[PDB]
Ligand binder design. Sequence first.
Ligand SMILES: [Zn+2]
Ligand SMILES: [Zn+2]
Lengths: 373, 370, 249, 40, 142
Amino acid sequence: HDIITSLPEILGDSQHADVGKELSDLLIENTSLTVPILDVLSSLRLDPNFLLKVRQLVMDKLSSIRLEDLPVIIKFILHSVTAMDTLEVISELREKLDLQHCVSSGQSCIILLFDVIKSAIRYEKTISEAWIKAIENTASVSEHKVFDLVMLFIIYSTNTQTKKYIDRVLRNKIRSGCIQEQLLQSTFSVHYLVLKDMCSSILSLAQSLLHSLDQSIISFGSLLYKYAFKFFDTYCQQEVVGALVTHICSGNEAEVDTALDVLLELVVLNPSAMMMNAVFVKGILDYLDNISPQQIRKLFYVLSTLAFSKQNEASSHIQDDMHLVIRKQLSSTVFKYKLIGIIGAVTMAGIMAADEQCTQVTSLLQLVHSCSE
Amino acid sequence: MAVTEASLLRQCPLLLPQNRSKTVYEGFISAQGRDFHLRIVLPEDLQLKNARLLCSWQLRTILSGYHRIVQQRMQHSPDLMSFMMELKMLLEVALKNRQELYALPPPPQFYSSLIEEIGTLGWDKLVYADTCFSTIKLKAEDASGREHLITLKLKAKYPAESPDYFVDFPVPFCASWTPQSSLISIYSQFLAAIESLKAFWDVMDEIDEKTWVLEPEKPPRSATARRIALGNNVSINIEVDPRHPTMLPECFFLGADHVVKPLGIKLSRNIHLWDPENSVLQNLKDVLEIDFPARAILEKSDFTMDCGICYAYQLDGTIPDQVCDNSQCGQPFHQICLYEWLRGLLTSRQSFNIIFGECPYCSKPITLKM
Amino acid sequence: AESLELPKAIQDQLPRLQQLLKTLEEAPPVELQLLHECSPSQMDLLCAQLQLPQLSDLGLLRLCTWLLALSPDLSLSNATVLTRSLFLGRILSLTSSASRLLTTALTSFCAKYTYPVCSALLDPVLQAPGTGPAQTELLCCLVKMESLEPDAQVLMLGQILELPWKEETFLVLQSLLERQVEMTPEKFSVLMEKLCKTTSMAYAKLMLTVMTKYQANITETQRLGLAMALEPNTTFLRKSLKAALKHLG
Amino acid sequence: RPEEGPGGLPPMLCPASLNICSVVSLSGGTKLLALSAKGR
Amino acid sequence: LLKAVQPLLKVSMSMRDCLILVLRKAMFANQLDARKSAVAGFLLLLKNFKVLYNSVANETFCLEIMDSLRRCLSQQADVRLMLYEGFYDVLRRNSQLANSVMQTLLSQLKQFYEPKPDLLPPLKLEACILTQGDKISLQEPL
Ligand SMILES: [Zn+2]
Ligand SMILES: [Zn+2]
């Protein structure tokens, strides 16, 4: 390892090619000494033609390198791109890499990897556009691997000229029946440590996904919100809930319904976390002009189910406000409001009954009975 | 060999058939330099589904637990030769697990050579030796005049393998053990590492002397971090590089945001005046252009230094560090207490790693960065 | 042709085993515990019907992972059958260096079942004709495992000594001898005897390593034996060998 | 202290007592009654 | 850039020793600008700092830089030119390497100055100029 790195100070400007050749001959022989050889060979004086051969020569053996080094090799591969060869080499790379085999040990090195990529595409634009084409153009095979999502996310997270392009690609992908749960499932289950950094991007996506039609799209957006809230940190959780609130309130029917289903998922998954962001959830009630009674049923279910967690009677606030809005709707000639108050009240009552509770339910139902009489 | 006529001899030499009809085998089975008594009666034919196998009580105590596997293996295994090979492997595994049980040191080579070598060191050095003579501990002195210990743990075979070296100091200690080397060799290496790291000790000693070091209280020799207290209810925590101690350490400031700001500003503007020929304190003093208190009164100065929520010091390692940005409160807290507090309240809003809220005592804008 | 029957439970549970194994390529199941039911002959028949040699490398690693988690250890003989079925064909098919996943799988499996794996795969790969770098790199990696305990290293040495000696044997032996493995004088004598009986640099490196790290064990007869095997000048590093030899005198 | 790998044992520097027996105080150390081989 | 970021390199030594790898490697890189900028950075390291841990390895490490620069003294015009303008500033801070600089200059000067009186062209002006098929360029600005 020592003598090799010392090579270029020693040799004159003549007998390089044969050394390059001989070294390439060692390179196919031994994988242990990929990195230092490549270091030297980037430093010596060679024909461009020899380089390209060595590029292909390393890339066939790309699976074989022990993990630690894999990063630095790609560094080489991705400094060693022209404008014109971009898409072949990228397509090959995209094919040949795995992320499946590798996995503190695995994850750290992968993280470094993705750093290297991030760097590469930050500091040279063409890699980005070619790379997406190398997923878009490989629409054919259903078998797409953990990698392709992660990379699309990353590029969305970075340079923002491409966002529309990514969005179009991701729609065409979803309708086409490529991109699906089990992919996203394994994505967020394995590569969380990468993705956590790039929440913002995920949601600037997810908002764009739900606004369209085609229930499979919208369900994909659902899964985004779900895992986003499941696996990240607090700030992300808050942004999730806020976004969902937005989705409900502004809303149209499909979107709304999905969003409410998601709400249900969030609360049943992790109520404890949802409780401290219940506050924004409550402010929906200021907006009911838009919502249909079915939706209302789910909405009050959510709110009440959150409310009568035993520890946050400190914030029985929501309980009082819901009692208030019940009171106001029931107190109306208009059947359109009457039904809302009725359903809300009864549904609330069902939830609190898992004897002050008994006093509440009795008073509630007697009032409802009297109004509906 | 291929056939079970010589292969059996070669793989279990000490099983001698007693009977003419090779039906009674008797003798010893070998495993990690230990011969165990064994007697293996076959039926009239060569079948192991049913066979007798009696042992020494030594072998029973060593084949405790694995009773089910051998009974099972007798039925599943085709030949006797293979049964012996397989039985040996399992006995190997069993003893390899019971190495807390079967461990001994040879009297000749060992005890004498060790006494010679400790004499070769000198008896001013040795401080501790265990009654099993496995562990020993040695002492050395800095040129600065500090005592540093080194623990060695010795096996049955000391000169063959490396002895387990445990040392305090914070850089990873690397000991080139040879079979020819001895305690004096590693000792010289130990002093060498001490004299290399000499500067780091000198730095940390100057800090622990002339400053109110706070939270490595009674610091070990391994400890590289130093939370220094300065002024009142504000602190600077300092991490120092052992290889380059005199070089600038990573440092930042806890306390009141309105109080901390002129320290960071003054540091930033004057940091070029940092000079790595002086000491850390002698540099910091003209860099930050302030002095430290030298034990104002460090156990109780005049402040209920408890959390003012939990009213304790030392919650789970954590110190009162998060304070108010207010002259009238200045109330310290813990990260945990103040977090749980602010996360409850309705007024609080969370940015990325920050929560803004009202100080419990004075209801003024207080920031917490996780 | 041998008309062997799988155990009743095995014939019955064979599709159950095959389903889960198929699933593995896309906590161990109770199905794997049935492996302890098989005789070695039965294991041989079962592995073939399972098509264990046709798993992908990923499936192979997962299966090895499962086997390492299996309650009590496999007997030597059943483990041997499994080892040969899993890796022999794959290793012999290697042209380029073994993939990262392959090397990892093999080395991770070796660590627990050291003797069965080494004895099953070491001999036939090295004795296979046209064995090349692609094969020897894995053997070098095996002998380099930290998990290859000193006694297991001794066993590997004993096994290597029985092979015919060619350049590939010299490389693997040098790699194993690099760990400074202890040897009885009898085994050391066998090593030296085979050693003393030449034109290649690999043989020179092997000879130099033995002459330098095990100098304390080298008798006068062994020194002369080394001297004779080094005599020709085609060998590389003749002078250094000469120096080491003179140092032993 | 599973139980004990090696048998580590100190003397108490008392002589050859045959027929030891213990009364457990837990009050204030442990107090045994021995009969020394010399008949004491 | 490097001048701008230099107050970092004053403080933090890990940054320096991580930069040194990049400079040394770019010294041999096949692009021309690689050595120009690598040179530049080298001069910026020797200009602004004494220490680049004992103050014996400091001097030897500076000398190692200067030795690589000694090789650089045999290159094309640009590299030598930059070295020269740098050397004044290196002196005007780092007096400690005075001698190791000045001999280094005089040697290279004494290639193109003749020490005998009563030879009227005391400088070999052709020897300064290399010609490779009618393409004719200066090396070593005297
Ligand atoms: Zn507290
Ligand atoms: Zn306050």
